[PDB]
């Protein structure tokens, strides 16, 4: 699924460090974005939690995506879930970083 490509939290061409820089401006736990990683089937969620910037790998495989041991039908479904449920300790994805 390519629905994530038009979402305000999704960035097609953003490195790890570029993402960190973006997350520096308004340092708030819960800030996040998603970026394509260098591998063809890989994404990263970059977010602020407990005062730190963290990166979480998401793998696309066939028709689903995987975060840890949790499978979702799509990247948009995954992010929607973790906007309403904790991703990292108690922190949800709260504040999407766009531009």
XYZ file of N, CA, C and O in Angstrom:
396
model
N 0.853 -1.181 0.000
C 0.000 0.000 0.000
C 0.886 1.227 0.000
O 1.930 1.239 0.656
N 0.463 2.259 -0.730
C 1.220 3.498 -0.844
C 0.510 4.677 -0.204
O 0.914 5.820 -0.430
N -0.527 4.435 0.604
C -1.273 5.539 1.197
C -0.404 6.396 2.106
O -0.670 7.593 2.272
N 0.622 5.804 2.715
C 1.475 6.570 3.606
C 2.187 7.680 2.865
O 2.600 8.650 3.492
N 2.366 7.543 1.547
C 3.254 8.468 0.846
C 2.696 9.879 0.859
O 3.460 10.844 0.712
N 1.388 10.028 1.042
C 0.764 11.350 1.063
C 0.466 11.836 2.471
O -0.113 12.922 2.648
N 0.888 11.096 3.489
C 0.604 11.489 4.859
C 1.613 12.505 5.381
O 2.813 12.422 5.100
N 1.125 13.448 6.204
C 1.956 14.575 6.629
C 3.146 14.129 7.466
O 4.140 14.853 7.555
N 3.077 12.950 8.080
C 4.179 12.454 8.889
C 5.200 11.675 8.089
O 6.235 11.315 8.665
N 4.959 11.446 6.804
C 5.815 10.596 5.989
C 6.753 11.425 5.112
O 6.335 12.385 4.465
N 8.016 11.014 5.071
C 9.065 11.710 4.329
C 9.808 10.724 3.434
O 10.441 9.780 3.918
N 9.767 10.972 2.132
C 10.357 10.027 1.172
C 11.873 10.061 1.173
O 12.508 9.040 0.876
N 12.464 11.202 1.485
C 13.905 11.401 1.316
C 14.389 12.159 2.529
O 14.525 13.383 2.515
N 14.625 11.421 3.604
C 15.076 12.033 4.832
C 15.979 11.049 5.545
O 15.569 9.925 5.806
N 17.220 11.449 5.815
C 18.128 10.532 6.474
C 17.832 10.527 7.955
O 17.078 11.363 8.454
N 18.434 9.561 8.657
C 18.348 9.536 10.113
C 18.706 10.890 10.727
O 17.938 11.465 11.498
N 19.866 11.419 10.377
C 20.324 12.656 11.000
C 19.458 13.851 10.611
O 19.143 14.690 11.461
N 19.021 13.921 9.355
C 18.082 14.967 8.958
C 16.799 14.902 9.785
O 16.236 15.937 10.171
N 16.314 13.691 10.057
C 15.142 13.530 10.906
C 15.399 14.029 12.322
O 14.572 14.725 12.907
N 16.523 13.618 12.917
C 16.892 14.123 14.236
C 16.898 15.641 14.263
O 16.349 16.257 15.174
N 17.531 16.258 13.268
C 17.561 17.723 13.209
C 16.159 18.314 13.223
O 15.893 19.293 13.944
N 15.241 17.729 12.439
C 13.864 18.209 12.420
C 13.215 18.075 13.784
O 12.443 18.945 14.200
N 13.517 16.993 14.506
C 12.907 16.760 15.797
C 13.527 17.610 16.893
O 13.033 17.604 18.019
N 14.604 18.329 16.595
C 15.231 19.184 17.589
C 14.464 20.465 17.827
O 14.525 21.021 18.928
N 13.786 20.970 16.801
C 13.281 22.337 16.853
C 12.258 22.500 17.972
O 12.378 23.388 18.824
N 11.243 21.647 17.991
C 10.277 21.658 19.083
C 10.497 20.385 19.883
O 9.844 19.365 19.617
N 11.420 20.382 20.833
C 11.684 19.149 21.573
C 10.530 18.842 22.504
O 10.388 19.462 23.559
N 9.668 17.924 22.080
C 8.575 17.432 22.902
C 8.508 15.927 22.763
O 8.550 15.405 21.647
N 8.440 15.234 23.888
C 8.136 13.819 23.841
C 6.832 13.636 23.067
O 5.896 14.421 23.222
N 6.798 12.644 22.166
C 5.649 12.394 21.312
C 5.760 12.926 19.898
O 4.940 12.556 19.038
N 6.731 13.793 19.626
C 6.954 14.237 18.261
C 7.433 13.060 17.428
O 8.209 12.224 17.927
N 6.993 13.011 16.171
C 7.392 11.891 15.309
C 7.294 12.202 13.817
O 6.554 13.078 13.363
N 7.979 11.357 13.048
C 7.842 11.295 11.605
C 8.187 9.869 11.189
O 8.709 9.080 11.978
N 7.894 9.539 9.938
C 8.288 8.264 9.352
C 9.092 8.562 8.107
O 8.778 9.502 7.375
N 10.136 7.770 7.881
C 11.018 7.990 6.745
C 11.359 6.660 6.112
O 11.349 5.623 6.762
N 11.623 6.697 4.811
C 12.109 5.516 4.119
C 13.570 5.281 4.485
O 14.370 6.224 4.527
N 13.913 4.037 4.795
C 15.303 3.699 5.075
C 16.005 3.336 3.771
O 15.390 3.259 2.711
N 17.319 3.131 3.855
C 18.083 2.838 2.645
C 17.766 1.473 2.028
O 17.948 1.306 0.820
N 17.282 0.501 2.797
C 16.890 -0.780 2.212
C 15.534 -0.691 1.513
O 14.644 0.050 1.953
N 15.320 -1.486 0.461
C 14.119 -1.268 -0.374
C 12.809 -1.415 0.377
O 11.815 -0.778 0.007
N 12.782 -2.219 1.430
C 11.537 -2.634 2.072
C 11.488 -2.131 3.501
O 10.817 -2.730 4.340
N 12.213 -1.062 3.812
C 12.405 -0.673 5.202
C 12.014 0.781 5.431
O 12.268 1.640 4.581
N 11.418 1.036 6.594
C 11.076 2.369 7.053
C 11.565 2.550 8.479
O 11.847 1.590 9.189
N 11.617 3.808 8.916
C 11.908 4.098 10.301
C 10.910 5.099 10.838
O 10.521 6.042 10.142
N 10.454 4.849 12.059
C 9.727 5.845 12.830
C 10.771 6.561 13.678
O 11.483 5.912 14.451
N 10.896 7.874 13.508
C 11.792 8.680 14.336
C 10.927 9.529 15.245
O 10.026 10.226 14.772
N 11.192 9.455 16.547
C 10.309 10.071 17.506
C 11.093 10.452 18.743
O 12.206 9.964 18.981
N 10.475 11.306 19.542
C 11.043 11.763 20.799
C 10.310 11.101 21.951
O 9.086 11.165 22.011
N 11.053 10.453 22.840
C 10.479 9.765 23.990
C 11.443 9.885 25.155
O 12.635 9.612 24.998
N 10.931 10.274 26.321
C 11.767 10.381 27.515
C 12.957 11.307 27.293
O 14.067 11.029 27.748
N 12.737 12.409 26.584
C 13.768 13.384 26.317
C 14.792 12.993 25.273
O 15.712 13.775 25.012
N 14.662 11.825 24.659
C 15.638 11.345 23.693
C 14.973 11.152 22.337
O 13.758 10.992 22.245
N 15.769 11.176 21.280
C 15.280 10.813 19.957
C 15.553 9.341 19.750
O 16.669 8.857 19.997
N 14.515 8.607 19.327
C 14.626 7.186 19.108
C 14.195 6.889 17.685
O 13.470 7.669 17.068
N 14.735 5.804 17.161
C 14.414 5.317 15.828
C 13.977 3.868 15.923
O 14.663 3.046 16.538
N 12.870 3.553 15.257
C 12.245 2.240 15.301
C 12.087 1.739 13.871
O 11.452 2.411 13.053
N 12.656 0.566 13.568
C 12.573 0.028 12.223
C 11.240 -0.678 11.992
O 10.744 -1.402 12.864
N 10.664 -0.443 10.808
C 9.438 -1.089 10.341
C 9.772 -1.771 9.027
O 10.333 -1.151 8.122
N 9.386 -3.029 8.898
C 9.736 -3.807 7.722
C 8.495 -4.063 6.899
O 7.464 -4.457 7.444
N 8.587 -3.792 5.605
C 7.559 -4.167 4.662
C 7.921 -5.536 4.130
O 9.065 -5.784 3.737
N 6.956 -6.426 4.153
C 7.134 -7.750 3.595
C 5.830 -8.133 2.930
O 4.774 -8.099 3.559
N 5.894 -8.455 1.657
C 4.697 -8.719 0.919
C 3.680 -7.620 1.083
O 3.947 -6.451 0.772
N 2.509 -8.003 1.584
C 1.366 -7.118 1.666
C 1.132 -6.571 3.072
O 0.064 -6.009 3.317
N 2.099 -6.711 3.984
C 1.954 -6.284 5.371
C 3.223 -5.559 5.819
O 4.245 -5.548 5.124
N 3.167 -4.952 7.006
C 4.338 -4.331 7.618
C 4.456 -4.890 9.023
O 3.486 -5.359 9.616
N 5.659 -4.834 9.557
C 5.950 -5.460 10.832
C 6.768 -4.505 11.685
O 7.745 -3.920 11.213
N 6.351 -4.348 12.931
C 7.085 -3.580 13.939
C 7.312 -4.523 15.111
O 6.358 -4.901 15.796
N 8.558 -4.897 15.344
C 8.808 -5.909 16.351
C 8.067 -7.164 15.922
O 8.251 -7.660 14.808
N 7.184 -7.674 16.775
C 6.409 -8.860 16.442
C 4.973 -8.527 16.057
O 4.145 -9.438 15.934
N 4.668 -7.251 15.845
C 3.317 -6.786 15.575
C 3.162 -6.500 14.090
O 3.843 -5.630 13.551
N 2.248 -7.222 13.456
C 1.953 -7.096 12.040
C 0.724 -6.220 11.823
O -0.246 -6.285 12.589
N 0.786 -5.361 10.806
C -0.326 -4.533 10.387
C -0.468 -4.663 8.883
O 0.487 -4.994 8.195
N -1.666 -4.370 8.367
C -1.899 -4.440 6.931
C -1.172 -3.352 6.159
O -1.033 -3.455 4.943
N -0.776 -2.266 6.808
C -0.169 -1.173 6.082
C 0.507 -0.245 7.070
O 0.204 -0.250 8.268
N 1.394 0.578 6.531
C 2.073 1.568 7.345
C 1.085 2.588 7.930
O 1.220 3.002 9.083
N 0.058 2.984 7.180
C -0.913 3.919 7.745
C -1.659 3.291 8.920
O -1.972 3.970 9.910
N -2.001 2.010 8.809
C -2.679 1.334 9.916
C -1.780 1.243 11.139
O -2.235 1.393 12.284
N -0.506 0.952 10.915
C 0.445 0.903 12.011
C 0.511 2.242 12.727
O 0.432 2.320 13.955
N 0.653 3.321 11.970
C 0.814 4.615 12.627
C -0.476 4.995 13.326
O -0.463 5.489 14.457
N -1.612 4.778 12.666
C -2.895 5.040 13.308
C -2.992 4.320 14.646
O -3.424 4.902 15.645
N -2.575 3.055 14.687
C -2.611 2.313 15.942
C -1.775 2.992 17.017
O -2.209 3.126 18.180
N -0.569 3.426 16.657
C 0.349 3.928 17.670
C 0.141 5.404 17.944
O 0.843 5.959 18.780
N -0.830 6.023 17.286
C -1.329 7.315 17.724
C -2.321 7.186 18.854
O -2.590 8.178 19.540
N -2.860 5.986 19.056
C -3.880 5.715 20.063
C -3.409 4.742 21.135
O -4.066 4.614 22.178
N -2.287 4.076 20.925
C -1.717 3.112 21.837
C -0.240 3.386 22.018
O 0.419 3.825 21.082
N 0.314 3.079 23.186
C 1.736 3.349 23.413
C 2.636 2.592 22.450
O 2.510 1.374 22.269
N 3.609 3.310 21.896
C 4.676 2.704 21.114
C 5.905 2.380 21.949
O 6.527 1.332 21.763
N 6.263 3.268 22.867
C 7.522 3.180 23.594
C 7.211 3.579 25.018
O 6.798 4.709 25.266
N 7.351 2.632 25.928
C 6.873 2.824 27.278
C 5.445 3.344 27.267
O 4.531 2.647 26.825
N 5.233 4.558 27.730
C 3.892 5.091 27.836
C 3.579 6.058 26.721
O 2.446 6.531 26.623
N 4.549 6.344 25.872
C 4.427 7.419 24.914
C 3.759 6.886 23.656
O 4.139 5.834 23.142
N 2.735 7.594 23.214
C 2.116 7.397 21.918
C 2.767 8.323 20.899
O 3.463 9.284 21.240
N 2.487 8.069 19.624
C 2.868 9.012 18.583
C 1.846 10.129 18.596
O 0.671 9.904 18.299
N 2.282 11.327 18.941
C 1.342 12.397 19.188
C 1.474 13.548 18.219
O 0.462 14.032 17.713
N 2.700 14.003 17.957
C 2.941 15.262 17.256
C 3.697 14.973 15.963
O 4.939 14.970 15.942
N 2.988 14.813 14.859
C 3.660 14.622 13.556
C 4.416 15.841 13.052
O 3.921 16.975 13.042
N 5.611 15.562 12.563
C 6.507 16.561 12.021
C 6.420 16.505 10.503
O 6.690 15.466 9.877
N 6.049 17.636 9.920
C 5.866 17.745 8.482
C 6.887 18.679 7.840
O 7.829 18.220 7.195
N 6.718 19.985 7.989
C 7.582 20.914 7.263
C 7.961 22.119 8.119
O 9.120 22.540 8.134
